[PDB]
Amino acid sequence: EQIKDKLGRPIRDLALSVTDRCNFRCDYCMPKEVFGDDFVFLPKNELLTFDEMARIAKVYAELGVKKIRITGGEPLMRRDLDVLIAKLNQIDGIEDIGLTTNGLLLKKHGQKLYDAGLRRINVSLDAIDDTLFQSINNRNIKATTILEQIDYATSIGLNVKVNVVIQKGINDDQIIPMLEYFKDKHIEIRFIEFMDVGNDNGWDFSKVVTKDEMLTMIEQHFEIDPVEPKYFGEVAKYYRHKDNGVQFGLITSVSQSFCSTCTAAALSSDGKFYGCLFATVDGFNVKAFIRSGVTDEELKEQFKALWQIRDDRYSDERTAQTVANRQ
Amino acid sequence: QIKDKLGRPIRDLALSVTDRCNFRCDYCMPKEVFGDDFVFLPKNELLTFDEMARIAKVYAELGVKKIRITGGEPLMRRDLDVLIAKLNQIDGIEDIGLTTNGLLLKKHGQKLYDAGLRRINVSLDAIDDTLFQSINNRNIKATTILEQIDYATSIGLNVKVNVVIQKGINDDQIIPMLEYFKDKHIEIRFIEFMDVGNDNGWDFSKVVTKDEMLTMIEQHFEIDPVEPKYFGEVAKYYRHKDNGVQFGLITSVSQSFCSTCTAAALSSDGKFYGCLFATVDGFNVKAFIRSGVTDEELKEQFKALWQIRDDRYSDERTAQTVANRQ
Ligand SMILES: C[S@@+](CC[C@H](N)C(=O)[O-])C[C@H]1O[C@@H](n2cnc3c(N)ncnc32)[C@H](O)[C@@H]1O
Ligand SMILES: C[S@@+](CC[C@H](N)C(=O)[O-])C[C@H]1O[C@@H](n2cnc3c(N)ncnc32)[C@H](O)[C@@H]1O
Ligand code: SF4
Ligand code: SF4
Ligand code: SF4
Ligand code: SF4
Structure with missing residues (x-):
């Protein structure tokens, strides 16, 4: 009911990325030099369905998640997003749903x-x-x-x-x-x-x-x-x-x-797990795990295992490095 | 350049020169526990000024630029001026401070x-x-x-x-x-x-x-x-x-603020700690030096001890506090 990672941090928040698509091309995020005419976004079947996302949030709520943040991409571009909000509103333990847009x-x-x-x-x-x-x-x-x-x-x-x-x-x-x-x-x-x-x-x-x-x-x-x-x-x-x-x-x-108080997990648009909003390598493939046929118990235990080995602290890493660079 | 498990470099040494004090501050050295009968460290169980200057020079070569003198109350030691003069002649060392x-x-x-x-x-x-x-x-x-x-x-x-x-x-x-x-x-x-x-x-x-x-x-x-x-x-x-x-x-x-912590500590009895708070008895630097070691073997010891450091006591309590607010 309460899980802690390698730095003693409990799981409390889930950022759900619901699309990789966006209607802006902000220079510092989706620069058009990278995300231009020939950029190929995720095929639609490679995204998590709303049912899969709600199943995931349910099991995460069982492990102490209270807050879900909907993001992207630009989340309002995801068709019938209200259906997702409605399913997430049906989950015990989830106290807050937020949208970044x-x-x-x-x-x-x-x-x-x-x-x-x-x-x-x-x-x-x-x-x-x-x-x-x-x-x-x-x-x-x-x-x-x-x-x-x-x-x-x-x-x-x-x-x-x-x-x-x-x-x-x-x-x-x-x-x-x-x-x-x-x-x-x-x-x-x-x-x-x-x-x-x-x-x-x-x-x-x-x-x-x-x-x-x-x-x-x-x-x-x-x-x-x-x-x-x-x-x-x-x-x-x-x-x-x-x-x-x-x-x-x-x-x-x-x-x-402030990585010391960081209680957030993230799921990308292609359904991979991240213990940090920053991440240069592919995470565990939650999507392929679910789609292979698993019980809710097997889901929960994998989710628990993923948080317990978590030691992400990207921003604190950059801070220690800045201090060392001032040699 | 020498960094620890959390990517932090050494820049500081907290140097405890005595276990004795002329105060009995409630939250520090309460009069109960530290009464009359308390036997502090014998003179010869303390580090010599020569041991200390040697240790500080090896540390300077690994990145240390500040020494902080403590105890105890450091002014209960010894001919403290002699230690300070010797530390002041180590080129790597740019600041010496004293907590008193x-x-x-x-x-x-x-x-x-x-x-x-x-x-x-x-x-x-x-x-x-x-x-x-x-x-x-x-x-x-x-x-x-x-x-x-x-x-x-x-x-x-x-x-x-x-x-x-x-x-x-x-x-x-x-x-x-x-x-x-x-x-x-x-x-x-x-x-x-x-x-x-x-x-x-x-x-x-x-x-x-x-x-x-x-x-x-x-x-x-x-x-x-x-x-x-x-x-x-x-x-x-x-x-x-x-x-x-x-x-x-x-x-x-x-x-x-453990993320930016660049300090090693050396106790009055001559043990290394990677945190000003530590339950585990540190590496006995005193017994190591008194057994007969060269400066390179001392340097390779300090470097190994730092590279292996993952201390973050305050951050650990912070993370448990968040876990308690549950
Ligand atoms: C990736 S967008 C997703 C949600 C939605 N498209 C939006 O822009 O609000 C989430 C946030 O990431 C932030 N972000 C991206 N790169 C950043 C950076 N280098 N520094 C600070 N914030 C950044 C954006 O400013 C934005 O508020
Ligand atoms: C151990 S004394 C050594 C130097 C000198 N005897 C002195 O008191 O300044 C160093 C510092 O430890 C601090 N200290 C001890 N326990 C503390 C605590 N629980 N919280 C904050 N500071 C503490 C004291 O305030 C003191 O300033
Ligand atoms: S995701 Fe948000 S920030 Fe990024 S390009 Fe789109 S609008 Fe800009
Ligand atoms: S950088 Fe730190 S705070 Fe930001 S998400 Fe990652 S771990 Fe959490
Ligand atoms: S060491 Fe410093 S704080 Fe501690 S008892 Fe002495 S004076 Fe008080
Ligand atoms: S608690 Fe943190 S800051 Fe304080 S000394 Fe230890 S590691 Fe460094």
Whole structure:
């Protein structure tokens, strides 16, 4: 009922990747040089079905998983995603379902998702200037379009948070504008340090604005209070406007790595297991295991075995290496 | 370059020079356990200064650039100035620091400075004379230790102060001590109290977290957060807005930092540890050296011992705490 990995960390979260497809080509994620005209995405039968995903989440819930995060790819591109939300809402032990999306398809699908039981979405939005944002997504999508999707989301009763990755020289001028826009909306925004591994190979700091450099900027424009963490090991450092009381947060992905409290497993779009959101090698093939014909007991024991041998700490590895590189 | 199992390099050596102390701090060397009848290490069971300088030179060749002198209370040793002069002549070694309760600073400060010591770290858990005396058990006033700090300062030593904050005991010293050392232009660091519970996770009942210290501080003082001087700096730094004096908060328990830990330790009885906390008796360096070994065999031993290190005690308790919040 509670499993711990090699670093003593219990399993609590499952990131479910539901597609490899996307409607953006963000330079730092799906650059069109790699994901271009001749890129071949997964054949449709090589994806996990919703029944397989729900079976997997069920057994994982038996081992202490309480939270499921739907991701991709752009998850709203997966047809009949509401069917998945509905099945996951039927599983005992699962307390929270979250969706990470660029938000473009929220007007199209949000109502379906809400009907099926979705209440929480995290919208990734890297700028609020239309020209800047278009140069980032490379699919001519205006920031203005996304803001309208966000307002529609809240209108139907979805709880919306916004996530922003700051790259020095690119969108670091977006911090103050985005803070003010969403402060007025009473929407929580999070800024995230850009993760980039150099040649050496700790962190590449050339495009990083750190949590602390970010916080020096903010303090010159706004009057703010540190918020004490809601719970032990809360990753995001929160602050609130004195106005007002609207909260925003800063994520120290690079300056202050947090693998020590990492309780997350991931399943890729092709149904392979990962104990870390980063991963250069193929994981155990959960998909082929399930499809070969197994009982729920055999599934559970393999899942348990996979967590117990887990020792992933990619970001902490990069941190130790950065320290060593400062020889 | 020499890295451990978690990819961490050696950069530091915590060097314990004595098992003796002139204080009896409740949470450290309680008077019960360490009473009159307690036999500390015989002089010849300690490492010689020559053994220590030899060990430090081998370590410098493997990456170490800082030595931190502790105990015990290091000023109970010996002709400490002689050790310091010898460590100061090792080229690989760029900084020597000393952790002290500060009591013997009028007695030994000058000769240590003359020997090459430039930085000291004075532990002082209370500024109030009564509360201090009941923490330390030896009737030493905070006023005494304060006066020692002003002496060390006047002879040229750079002084920082460390305060371990226990909720039911220390709590109310945060503001008086900040105010005092602010006028003095001395950096003070407040440290989260480290206690492990019956569940093997952190025990938060005596802990005042960095975050609740900061709430406290922002009511009485006007503060600027200070950007970390270098990557993986442990202490969180803040700056008084009027005179610019910095102070620090150390997240021992609320944000443990084993990932950037580059320290080896050597005990007063001459054992190696890869963690300032260790249940397992370390590699006996003393018996190894006294058996008759060359510098290369000593070097190959230290290198092997480091490469095999996977210590992460605080992170282990952090991960169990998360597992307990279950
Ligand atoms: C891979 S997308 C999947 C969900 C959806 N397509 C979206 O963009 O929100 C998930 C997140 O990964 C983040 N990401 C990818 N590369 C990153 C990097 N190098 N540094 C910080 N975040 C990164 C994106 O910014 C995005 O918020
Ligand atoms: C062992 S003493 C040695 C140097 C010198 N005798 C002194 O007290 O500064 C070093 C430090 O250990 C610290 N210490 C002992 N137990 C601790 C605990 N449970 N949590 C935080 N610090 C602790 C003391 O506060 C002291 O600053
Ligand atoms: S939208 Fe999300 S998944 Fe798509 S490229 Fe951008 S970040 Fe990546
Ligand atoms: S990098 Fe660390 S925190 Fe991030 S997913 Fe991997 S293990 Fe977890
Ligand atoms: S002074 Fe240092 S060594 Fe001595 S008992 Fe107190 S803390 Fe421990
Ligand atoms: S607990 Fe962590 S940081 Fe503290 S000394 Fe040990 S390994 Fe290093």
